Every structure is written in structure tokens, then in C-alpha cells.
Ligand binder design. Structure first.
Ligand SMILES: O=C(Nc1ccc(N2CCOCC2)cc1N1CCOCC1)c1cccc(Oc2ccccc2)c1
Ligand SMILES: O=C(Nc1ccc(N2CCOCC2)cc1N1CCOCC1)c1cccc(Oc2ccccc2)c1
Ligand SMILES: O=C(Nc1ccc(N2CCOCC2)cc1N1CCOCC1)c1cccc(Oc2ccccc2)c1
Ligand SMILES: O=C(Nc1ccc(N2CCOCC2)cc1N1CCOCC1)c1cccc(Oc2ccccc2)c1
Ligand SMILES: O=C(Nc1ccc(N2CCOCC2)cc1N1CCOCC1)c1cccc(Oc2ccccc2)c1
Ligand SMILES: O=C(Nc1ccc(N2CCOCC2)cc1N1CCOCC1)c1cccc(Oc2ccccc2)c1
Ligand SMILES: [Zn+2]
Ligand SMILES: [Zn+2]
Ligand SMILES: [Zn+2]
Ligand SMILES: [Zn+2]
Ligand SMILES: [Zn+2]
Ligand SMILES: [Zn+2]
Lengths: 268, 268, 274, 271, 271, 274
């Protein structure tokens, strides 16, 4: 079997970690004994099943120190199962909110986070693979402050106001061309990584929380940047400015963002 | 047969009136002897055939003095045929360009045009039917300066620069919410009718012709209106301002636009 | 041929009268059968929905009454599916009671309020006689025409338009109009519909207020299941209120028959006023 | 479908029927492949297509569940008729029939708490998984050797324990919001666990036994709680009353309830 | 498919074969339902599924065409084998075989212009419809009573008039852009009409008859025009040279060409 | 089993090497068979495309040569379809000739230019011997690895990436690389490919310029069909140019055999320089 198939029998559900409109996710033990995360899709129309096959067909091939690991799939009945490594501390947005002045985190730790996500994004960009909804909700955090990108899931249900109706679009993380022209690239993803870099250094506020979805857009579009955070070096806020270039071409490569971050994270 | 079926044999092609990527349109004579327009779709995948059935199923029911008349359809082989009344003077955008200082038209005639399109739009709005691409290219002109709305056709091919890639969207005719939020209503159609009213009173210039598709958007969005035309009364340019309200709710009803226009067109 | 089929081409839409997740409804012209009608058009149209739609035409093509909205035919020849009905110019009785109440002419007479209730009761006697059970009787679901002719305007898309009248479970149930056995047990009978009629009679005499409008759906239930009966409206004579009570007995067996309800409302209708 | 665990029919020997219903029979049987051992076999002879899909659905789910206090499921066979589901055999049967047997020798407070704790444990697992049981009662629990108690999820209880429903919903096990608004949550289950607790400490009485199905509903909704059993310490009645808050939100977690019950079980109070 | 016009096989009587090919035979036949009249019947016995769809395609198209100077098409039958297409019978056959017959009694200048005009008229209709013929020659035109000439669109010319192709493209009827860039437009047709004109005024010579298929191509592309026929007035040679501009865009419309030819036909020049 | 199948799970993508309407191409890791490869992935994948893709695997699974890019297997187990090949680190010979020409190290030696031409000719002898006809020989369609190993890197998505090298008809044909009979008649043979090779030899000796780069596609045709032969490059000794002429004879029969072309290029390769 070309894609990796895990047998249902080799899985034991332990508890629920998260819920959506299509999916649930559980902690479970896998035999052949280790813990894992299981995306159970119970809303299983053939359109949705095929989508789920296509998704597994892709993830089977991806592999990076900062892409949440995919162990495999079982379309042997219902619900449809996708199996990943368990990330013990969850999604980064809830993690930042935990571990912030509501002690906080060492500026080296905030830099290691940023760094570790940038790595993951360096992998996707060399693949010319566009993510289209990067955010701290869509990254995961494991033992030993390991961070990785936990692709999508059902974040649109969970973190509801972050998106907006039309489709549900993460407008607070999107550059203007993605908004206006609807173009999604590598360059729009960098932009979103600038917004991520903000999230990390605000210990996980919603971008423009003060503002609502329809006025949020008039801000992003009218070219107003986001404020430098208290916890934020101007060096770092330079990196953000370098992500936010109005013009996609004049924005930095995620490769260079990744180098500056990894340089700072060692030697702040 | 519930939809009106015309027999191929009862049609004789005379010449080609227009061309696209999906369709052609011909002048032909219909027996049971009169002239007509025939949309011949030769690109006939089942997805496209079904779409074409759905379209005929709808038009069979619509009927208005300012909606180009639909005589019927034949899916009896290939190419798929839709039959309409022949409009002798074509699309209004080419018509305005003909009959303008490149004599021109009596301000009563420019008002009769505007008026006659507004009627057509009054019919669609009471049906809560949203057109989504109104323009002078998408209206037609017959003997005795009769104007009607000639729904779509293949205008995206013919009048190419009027749209923009993503889908092809008539950005120069769209309000900001249609642009930004992607919402299309009755209220966005009125807005587009304001732009139409402009086209008529510029004898058919492209909105923001000076400007290109990506800067055109920064204009519409930043709330800059279009200049009052030379040939244009301020009364009329009041009607346009009343279509262009940033806020869809504060825009006029097409019913009221239609009354003011019909009032002026009698008594300028 | 068995069910009557209208041709699409014999239809000209004029405009929209009403809107729903499942259906829209237009005023149209109908050629042959020129005369006006209302067309229910369903652009939903799976096959489960396409079947239900044929099933309903198969039923409605056999019903006929002075006070059941008249059904002319159906066309399943493509999309959207079409069901053609008589046009009732003044629409749904709820919006009509609200239009024409203390909120000239002025508010309906008592005699007109009675004439309205008699005509609904009339429609409902026909259904009970077929041992047919409506399950959602309400003024929103009766229609009103020229010179105050009133008829039962069946389903449509009531759960979308008058959304706060229903409560969730994923069934949406007209809790405010339902007796205890229909809430608790989900037993819907002719006797549950008589209950609902009582609630309609209240709507009528309050120019179309939501029953227990001051209560949420959950405390609305509490009040109903506990026994609490709605207040006599300011407009409601005590003969009429007795009717409502008649319909609101807790034991289904003990409730009045729509046939009796209907003769008393007709009697009162004809009787001179105070 | 090597994925769910398949048992071969040939590796079963039916010994005798334990129980009977409208959709199932259950038999004690011997399973080859531990060369031999006893199991209980759910056999469905109804067996439409609609009913065979639900049976392969239920088994696909049960395959993944595992807990000291959820009836162990060994596997399934849909190679022909009847459809088989194989579970561990629990020697003493349903906890209701066990409680009537072992009550006025009667069971020690320590034992009744073990029983309550063991059920509660099973309910912690289901709540963990945000999985609603909807029909938790002593009759839907089974009892093994060494007073092991587990939850016995599917079967034909509505046929056997007929009067405990009304037409069919276990109204005596149900809170006002389940009865009135048809709402089932981990909160409505806790309510039912409250009643289960009552059942244990009454050695298996039907709640409101003295009232009919209609007037039962009336007391539930009107606010009226069940009476403190003779056998029930006031600490344990606190636990019952915690589960019986009218406001779902104000009702204890199963996780606390289980933690108290497990503590008391190992270190009971005087009474 | 009441839509295209169907002829019943029973209402046909085959009289004799006129012609023969790899995909067709054509017969003269009598059509009942004008109780009786002659027609030509294209009969295809090849008749794959691929080839039956193209035949119902071609007929669906021909049904809609109508012109004084396009071979009239009466209808079709795909009720079995062979597949039938029915056309008006044109008594004198292809205009090439007619031109060789009627040349050195020879035809009047007035008549040759009528011929050129009548073909041109047919080509105006196709250009009107933005419809490219791709293989316009005297052999693909037919001639009726009273020197009526029309275009005889489909058939088996490549089989009969074999040498006029190369392996198969009518390179002697084709402009440099058709040969070199495989481009067919109403412009490349006009080019071919130019050659057709040559053919008329040479009483049916093959263009470059004296050259082989390879070296023909070489003269076409190198720029070299065909010679003014003896029978061809300089006004008419102007028309030929107009159609032979190397630049498609600089080549006359068929509509002008037709207008001149029709004028000259009614009012010829001296020669 | 017949054709070799690689498992998807035995693939880790590392990054993208190239892109097209039909295909992308990644550098990957391949486990078992750890070693590097190039994976052709087609996300197009109708069935006409899915079949062509199986047909090509069925052919490529039988070819094997020192100078035909090595084919490891294919997986049709889902989307996207996968074809696994040896990784050639320095990519397509055209981009490589342009990299490493007058536009240190410095521009390739004559000996290296000859070593490159010999290796292509070598690959092309194998195809002619199978009487297989490439139809699009060009430096864009040969691949270059570690220490100047060169191989024929078949199709891919050449018509998208090197789009101006082709001309329309809706077929896209490498007009600049085609002899008269292939332009005019569309006759593609071993003899047409030898022609193309001559054009490759010119590309090689011009560090990868487009033939007739100063002419449009239509006047490029004129010049070819008229007889006009490309200029001797500044880098090209007259022995080598004689080779090109050898390949550019107008009569296919009169042209040299790739086998001869290949022995002369190998001879020159070994010969000491001036
Ligand atoms: O390991 C995963 N996720 C996880 C692990 C642990 C936890 N809790 C541990 C205890 O304290 C609270 C957090 C929560 C999550 N989730 C649930 C899914 O929503 C993203 C947060 C995981 C692994 C692979 C895929 C996966 O699916 C996703 C990924 C991102 C966003 C949504 C779903 C989740
Ligand atoms: O009557 C129709 N259209 C027409 C009539 C006449 C003419 N010419 C007459 C001679 O001087 C030039 C103009 C041109 C058109 N067209 C072609 C299609 O593009 C819209 C202009 C007609 C009728 C029904 C449907 C229809 O399809 C449309 C409608 C709008 C836009 C595009 C196609 C066209
Ligand atoms: O004729 C019908 N109905 C009508 C007539 C008129 C009007 N407006 C008149 C102007 O002031 C506002 C109301 C509204 C309706 N509707 C809309 C759909 O909601 C039922 C009321 C009609 C006739 C037969 C069937 C039918 O479908 C229904 C009926 C009731 C409820 C839902 C659908 C509607
Ligand atoms: O082992 C099982 N159950 C059992 C064991 C033993 C006995 N007897 C022991 C000796 O004195 C007489 C009773 C009775 C049962 N039943 C039969 C079905 O009614 C549930 C009690 C068993 C194991 C797994 C699943 C299963 O299916 C159920 C579970 C609950 C309710 C109904 C069926 C039964
Ligand atoms: O009536 C038709 N054609 C005809 C009439 C008569 C004659 N003879 C008349 C007496 O001296 C001998 C020749 C020959 C033809 N053919 C046969 C097929 O080769 C095209 C000339 C005719 C009518 C309609 C369609 C049709 O099919 C074609 C048309 C052009 C070329 C080939 C077939 C033929
Ligand atoms: O290994 C292969 N190819 C490669 C290796 C490396 C590189 N880059 C290295 C860094 O500097 C830029 C070039 C590029 C390619 N490509 C991309 C696809 O276009 C063929 C060149 C390869 C191996 C086998 C088959 C294959 O598919 C082809 C080959 C040629 C043309 C099209 C597809 C590619
Ligand atoms: Zn499986
Ligand atoms: Zn037809
Ligand atoms: Zn119909
Ligand atoms: Zn089996
Ligand atoms: Zn026939
Ligand atoms: Zn595979």
C-alpha cells in the first residue's frame, strides 16, 4: 500500500483534543506502544472522502523537522482517520496566551518559536507550496518547546472570528493582493508570517482586535502596518516591516527571515 | 415540451454577429419567416450542456419590454442553440461609440437609453435576481432606439480588458464590497447602473481608461467617484452620486432611479 | 399527465413575494390554464428533495376546498422545480393581522376577526375529515386575499421567514403552537391541531402576536407543559376565549372537535355584536 | 477490513443463549484463539443492508475504544448470517439483576462504592471523548468475577427492561432538559449517573417505582428529587444531589464525582 | 431529432451510382415526397461509431445552411445502414469535369464570369459565417441545368482527383501561410478562390500541371504567381492577383471580388 | 509488478526543481530502492493524461543507456501521478550552456564542448537503433550532472518553460530544430532527429543560443525551408561545422547517420586540440 495505512484495531482513543464541523481530533495510543493525534472525519460524503485521500496522498510525501509528522491514514470504514505525532502543548495561539503576562517567555524562547515556524515555512516555499492560512492557531507546540506547522484542521470553526463570510478568509493575516486581487503565493505567506511574528510578540492577540472584520480590511488595504509590540525589539519589528512590503516582490524571502531569526535566537 | 424547442431545420444561418471562447452568435431566419439571433455553443461538455439547459430553463420564464426576448432552445445535437429576437444595432457600448462626437445623440435620446436600461434592471430587482456584470456591452439596441439587457453572452472574450484575472471580474463596474468582501446584490447592481449611466453620457468610454486594472481598484476602493461628463447634467450626475453611495443601504432603489430618469426623458 | 403539469414556457415571473433556504416564491402570469398565480420554485433539488416535492404534488392534486389554497400544477421538467398555486394578494395572515391591527381603515372589526377564524376552522375541518394532520397550523401558514378570503397556505419556507416561532432538537418544531403530548411525546394528531387552532384563535384576537412573546423558547415550554394557558386578549369576548379553552384541554380526548369549534365560530360570526 | 478485528465463525462454539431481543440474541460461546476461552456473542439475524451497515459502523467505533470499565470488544464477523459481535463474557450479567440478588447477603458500603466508582470511571472515559451514552442505567452495566463492573453499551435493554421506558426513552434516567428540550449532553449523562447511584444504593429499585411513566415525568420536571436511600451516607447523597442540579452547567463533572467515589470506595465514611 | 430533416429509406429508390470513394458512394435516386423528383444520395458504409457521430454532426450543421450557391441538403437517415445524406441532384457534376468538356464549343467570357461569380457568391456566405472551407477547387463545385454552379461541400475528392493533393493537402490551391504555418482563414480561402478563377479561365487545367507536387510548393512559397490565361481579360487577372497577395491582410475580401465578378458577369469587358 | 512501482511513502519531497501546465518536478529522497531522485508529478490527471502517463512508464521501463536519464519507477496509486528518475544535479543542458559560457571557472573548453556533444549523440544512437524517433531533441531536453555527465532528459514540460522555441498550428512544434520535411510534410524520422542533432551541436558551440534568435518563428521557417544554414559559431572549428552540414543535408537519405556523427565527435573529443 503506497500511502501508510494504520489499522483501526492498532488505535485506542484516550480523549478528545479538539472539534469542528467536519472533524474531531483525539489523543490515542498507537500499537507497533506510542501516543499520537487522530483526525476523525465523520462527515464522510464521497467528495469529502476523495478530498481526504488526496490530502493523505500529499502529506505522505512531506517530511520536515517543523512540519507536524504524518504517520498515515485509514479509509477502512468510518470515521476516516488521519494519524499524526501528538503535540502535547497544542496550538501555539493558546500556548502563547498561556505563557504570557496573563512567568512569561524569555526573548530567546519567543525567537526560537518564530525561528522554528520560519523553518517550516522555508520547507513549503522551496516546494513552491502555498499554505494560504498561516497563524499561531495553525502551528503546534510539543515537549522541549518544539514548534511545527499543524497544517489546517478545523480552525475555521474553533477560532471563528479570525475569518469572514463571502468562503471564510483569514483577512487579518492576508496582504492586500490576496484581499483585493485574491492572489495567494509564497510572498503572501511571508506577509502572513510577519503577522505570526506579531502574534508571538503580543503573546497571541488577534491582529487589529480593537477593529472588526470590515474595518480591519480598510486598514490592511490603506497600508497601515501593525504597531511594534512592547515585548518587541525594533530589529525584529524590522523583520515584520520587511514581510509587510505592499509590493510582494520587495518582501523578503522566508529563507532570509529564517537566517536573521536563527542568528538572533542564538545571540540576542 | 416545457421549455420552448426550436427545430434546427426551421433555422437558416445568414451571417456571424459575434464570437467568444465557448460560443458564437449568428443572424438567422426562423420559419414559423422572421430574423433572430442564435447563440451557438460548440464547446459542449456535459457540465456545459447542463449549465445551458439550466440557463434556458430560467430565461423561458423571464419576459420584459427591456429584457432581450428568448424564443427558445435546441439541445438536439450540436452545436447547442439558444434563439433570441434580433437586435439590429448590436451592443450599446459599440452603439454609443458609433453615435457620439467620434451627429451625436439628443440628451432626450441619452435619457431614453438610461431609462430603458433602468426599466430592465427594475424587472430583475423585483425578482431579487442579481445580474453581477451590467455594462453597455451587455445591453443591446434595436430599430426605433429600443434598448434592452442582452444578459451576458461571451463579453469576457470580446471586451477583454474590462475584466481582470484571479475568474474574470468587471472591476471597473463593481462597488467596493463586491470587490473587497465579494458580496453581489441588487445594491451592487444599482452601483453598476451608475457606471452604465456614466458610459452612456461619455458615449461609451471605459471607466478610468486613463488607469490600469490594479490602480483602478485602489481608486474605486479609496472612494474616488468618476468625473461628471461634459454631455452630463448635474441633475443626472446626482443620480450617479446616488448610485455610488459607499454604503449599499444608502444607495437609491433602481425603482426611483427609473422614475427620475423617465421623468427627465419626457421633460428635460 | 396524472398530476397536472404546467409548462415552464406558460410562466412569466413578475416578481418575488417570499424567500427561503429551500424555496423562493414569485408572483407570475400563467398563460392558458392569462391569469395571476404564485409559483413555489425550489432551487435546492437533491433527489430526496426532488422526491419529497413530487410526493407533495401527488397529495395536493387530490385536495380541494373553499379554504385550502388552490393548487394548479407542478413542473419537474428541469430546475428549478415549480409548483403553481392561486395568487392570494395580501399574503400570510400573520403579517396581515400585524398590518391591520392597532399598530383609517383602522383595526379589523370583531366580525372580521370572527370571519377570519371561521374560514381557518373551515379549512381545518376538511383536513380532520381526511384524518390529515397539519402539524404546523399558524397565521404565518394561512394566506389572505381580496375581500378577506382566508385559506390554509400549507408549508412553504416558514422555518426561515418566522424563525423565532420554532426551537431546535436537528428538527425545528413550532413549540409555541404545540400541546404537551406534541412537545413531550411528539404525538401529532387531529387533537394536537385543534390545540394549535386555539393558539391561532389567540393570534387572530391579538392582531398576530407570538404566543408567550415575553418568554424564551425554553421557558415558553415550561409554561405550556406546566398547564399555564395564554391570557384572554383585550379584543377577545369571553364566548371566544371559551373556544380557546375548549381547544386547550390537557387530555386530547376531552378537547373540542374542530367541527364543533367551526360551528360555534360561524354562529358567533353571524350573531349581531354586543 | 483487516483493520477492525475479525473473528472467524468456525473459531466460535455456541454454548447457550444468555439473552434475546427484537434485533439481537446474545449467547455464551467458546473462542479458539489461550487455546480456548469464553466470550459473549451478539448475533443479529434481522440483517437488512441498513442494519448491516450500522453493525459494521458500531464495530468500527468499538474497535477503537478500550477501558478497564467499558465491556471489552474482541471483534466482528460480517462473513454471512447471523452478523456476529464478540465481547468478553461477564459472568454475573447486568448490574441491575446483580443488585437485586445481592440485597435484602446484602453488599458492604465499601462494595456499593466500588460499584459506583467503577461505573463513574467508564463514564469519565466517554466524557473524555465527548461521547454521550444517552441510556446509562444499572441494566446497561455488566458484572464479572471479583465484582468487576463495566458499561455494556449495546444490546436489547428496551425489550428485557420494558417498563423503564415510555414510547422509547428512559424518562426515569433523564433530566428535565432531555425530557423537555430533547437535549443529551455529558451533562444529561451525569444526571443519569446520579440516578444510577440511587439504583446501586437501593439494591436495584426502579426510580419512582411507586409512580406511573406519565406522573414520573411530572415530578422530574416539577423539581422533585429522589429520596436518600437507607443504605446511602449523607456524603453519597451530596454526590447524587450534585448530579441533580436542574442547571446542566451547575451539575458536577463526572471527573470530580468519580474522584470522590473512588476516594470513598478506598476509605468509606461511617454510617 | 425531428429537428434535423429526416428522409425515410423507403421513400428512396437508387437509380445508379454517380461516384465512389473510401468513406462514401454517391447515387442518383428518386425521392417520393412533387410526388417524385431526383436527388443525389451520399451513402457511408464505413460506419464506425466515431464516423456515425461525425455524419450526424455534419448533417446537424448542413441543416442550418441555405444559399443559392451552396448545394441544397434535403436531410439524413441514421435509421440503419448505410447512413444516408440526401442533396439536390446537379446534372453536370463537378465544375472541373464540366470545364474540360466545355473548352477547346468553348464557353463565352460572359459564362465563365457567371461561373466565377456563382462560386464567389457561395464563398461570400461561408466568409459571412466565419466558416473556412480549406479545400475550395472546381472539383468541389457542382453544375446544374441552366449553368447553375454551387459549392458541393463534402464527398471523396481526394480519392477521385488524386494527384491534386500530396500526403493529403491541396497544395496547388493553398497559400504560403497554409503550406508553411498550417494556417487556414477566410484569407487562405480567398487565395484558393484566386486559383479557382485560374481554373475556370483555363477550362480546368491543374495549377502548375507542368511541375511535380514537391517543386509546386517551391514556386508557391518563392513568390511566383500563375500565368494570365489566354481566355482571361486583364481586369480578371487583376482579381486573381488581388487574391494572391502574399500578405493575407493585403488580399481582397471575397465580398469585393464577388461584387466585381458579378458586375463584369452582367457587363463584361472586351477581349 | 511488471513496470516498477515506487511507493509514495518511500518519497520525501525536498523542493521544486521545475514547473509546467501538466507537471511539476521535485528533488526528493527515495528510501530503499536513502538516495536522491527527481520526481515528475502530474496534478493534471484526466484519464487520457493518466493513460498517456502509464504508456510512457511502460516504454521507459525497458529503455536503458549510459546517456538516457535513468528511470526508477512510477506510482499511479492516487494523485498526483509520480514518475521517479535519477537526479541530474546541474539540470537542463541549455540553462547549463548559458550559465557556463562567455556570459573562473570561465567558459567550457572545446574538449568539454565535444565531450558534451559526444554524450548526446551517444544517447541518440541508442534511440535510432530501436528505430525510436525523439521529435524534440534540444539542449533544454538533455540533463547535466556532477562532473559533466550528459543524458537525454526526454519530454517533461518543455513547451511551457522554453515557450518561444515552439510555434502554434493546436499543436506546438520546435520549428527552429526541424528540417523542411518535418515542417512542410510533418514527416518525423531518424533522419529528422539527425537534423535536430546538428541544431543541438550548434546550440552547444554557441553556449545555448536559440537558433535564428534574431528572426521570429515565421521568418525562422522561411530561412529553414529556403535552405539557409545557421552561421559557424565563433567557438566552432571547421571539422565540427562539417558535422552540422553533414546533419543539415536537404535530402534525408543524403544526411549522415547518428552512428557516424557519433564516431567523429568521439574521435575529435580524444584528438589533442589545435
Ligand atoms: O497534537 C495535535 N493537537 C493538540 C495537542 C494537544 C492539545 N492540548 C493538550 C492539553 O492542553 C491543551 C492542548 C491540543 C491540540 N489541538 C487540538 C486540535 O486543534 C489544535 C490544537 C495535533 C496533531 C496533528 C494534527 C492536529 O490537527 C490540527 C492541527 C492544527 C490545528 C487544528 C487541528 C492536531
Ligand atoms: O441581437 C443580438 N446581437 C447583435 C445584433 C447585431 C449586431 N450588429 C449588427 C450590425 O452592426 C454591428 C452590430 C451585433 C450583435 N452582437 C453580437 C453578440 O454580442 C453582442 C453584440 C443578440 C441577441 C441576443 C443575444 C445575444 O447575445 C449577446 C448579448 C450581449 C452581449 C453578447 C452576446 C445577442
Ligand atoms: O400568494 C402567496 N403568497 C404571498 C402573496 C403576497 C405576498 N406579499 C404581498 C405584499 O405584501 C407582502 C406580502 C406574500 C406572499 N407570501 C410570500 C411567501 O410566504 C407566504 C406569503 C402564496 C400562495 C400559495 C402558496 C404560497 O407559498 C407559501 C405560503 C405560505 C407560507 C410559505 C409559502 C404562497
Ligand atoms: O456477558 C454478557 N452478558 C450476560 C452475561 C451473563 C448473563 N447471565 C449470567 C447468569 O445469570 C443469568 C444472566 C446475562 C448477560 N446478559 C444477557 C443480555 O442482556 C444483558 C445481560 C454480555 C457481554 C457483552 C455484551 C453484551 O450485550 C449486552 C450488554 C448489555 C445489555 C444487553 C446486551 C452482553
Ligand atoms: O449531384 C451530385 N453529383 C454528381 C452529379 C452528376 C454526376 N455525373 C453527371 C453525368 O456525367 C457524369 C457525372 C457526377 C456527380 N458527382 C459524383 C461524386 O463526385 C462529385 C460529382 C452531388 C450532389 C450533392 C452532393 C454530392 O457529393 C459530392 C460533392 C462534391 C464532390 C464529391 C461528392 C454530389
Ligand atoms: O533532475 C532533473 N532536473 C533538474 C535538476 C536540477 C535543476 N536545477 C538545479 C539548480 O539550478 C537550476 C536547475 C533543474 C532540473 N530541471 C527542472 C525541470 O526541467 C528539467 C530540468 C530531472 C531528471 C529527470 C527528469 C526530469 O524531467 C524533465 C527533464 C527535462 C525537461 C523537463 C522535465 C528532470
Ligand atoms: Zn484500514
Ligand atoms: Zn431540437
Ligand atoms: Zn414541465
Ligand atoms: Zn468472517
Ligand atoms: Zn431513418
Ligand atoms: Zn503506488
Amino acid at each position: 500500500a503506497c500511502v501508510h495505512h494504520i489499522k483501526r484495531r492498532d488505535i485506542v482513543l484516550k480523549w478528545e483534543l479538539g472539534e469542528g464541523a467536519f472533524g474531531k481530533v483525539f489523543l490515542a495510543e498507537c500499537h507497533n506502544k506510542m501516543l499520537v493525534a487522530v483526525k476523525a472525519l465523520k462527515e464522510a460524503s464521497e467528495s469529502a472522502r476523495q478530498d481526504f485521500q488526496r490530502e493523505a496522498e500529499l502529506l505522505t510525501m512531506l517530511q520536515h523537522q517543523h512540519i507536524v509528522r504524518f504517520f498515515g491514514v485509514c479509509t477502512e470504514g468510518r470515521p476516516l482517520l488521519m494519524v499524526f505525532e501528538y503535540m502535547r502543548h497544542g496550538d501555539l495561539n493558546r500556548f502563547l496566551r498561556s505563557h504570557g503576562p496573563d512567568g512569561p517567555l524569555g526573548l530567546g524562547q519567543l525567537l526560537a518559536v518564530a525561528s522554528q515556524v520560519a523553518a517550516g515555512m522555508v520547507y513549503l516555499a522551496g516546494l513552491h507550496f502555498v499554505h494560504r492560512d498561516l497563524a499561531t492557531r495553525n502551528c503546534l507546540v510539543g515537549q522541549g518547546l518544539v514548534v511545527k506547522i499543524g497544517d489546517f484542521g478545523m480552525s475555521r470553526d474553533i477560532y471563528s472570528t479570525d475569518y469572514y463570510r463571502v468562503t471564510m478568509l483569514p483577512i487579518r493575516w492576508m496582504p492586500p493582493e490576496s484581499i483585493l486581487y485574491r492572489k495567494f503565493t509564497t510572498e503572501s505567506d511571508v506577509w502572513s508570517f510577519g503577522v505570526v511574528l506579531w502574534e508571538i510578540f503580543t503573546y497571541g492577540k488577534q491582529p487589529w482586535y480593537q477593529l472588526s472584520n470590515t474595518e480591519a480590511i480598510d486598514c490592511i488595504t490603506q497600508g497601515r502596518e501593525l504597531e511594534r509590540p512592547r515585548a518587541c525589539p525594533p530589529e525584529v519589528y524590522a523583520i515584520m516591516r520587511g514581510c509587510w512590503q505592499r509590493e510582494p516582490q520587495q518582501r523578503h524571502s522566508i529563507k532570509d527571515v529564517h537566517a536573521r531569526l536563527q542568528a538572533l535566537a542564538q545571540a540576542p
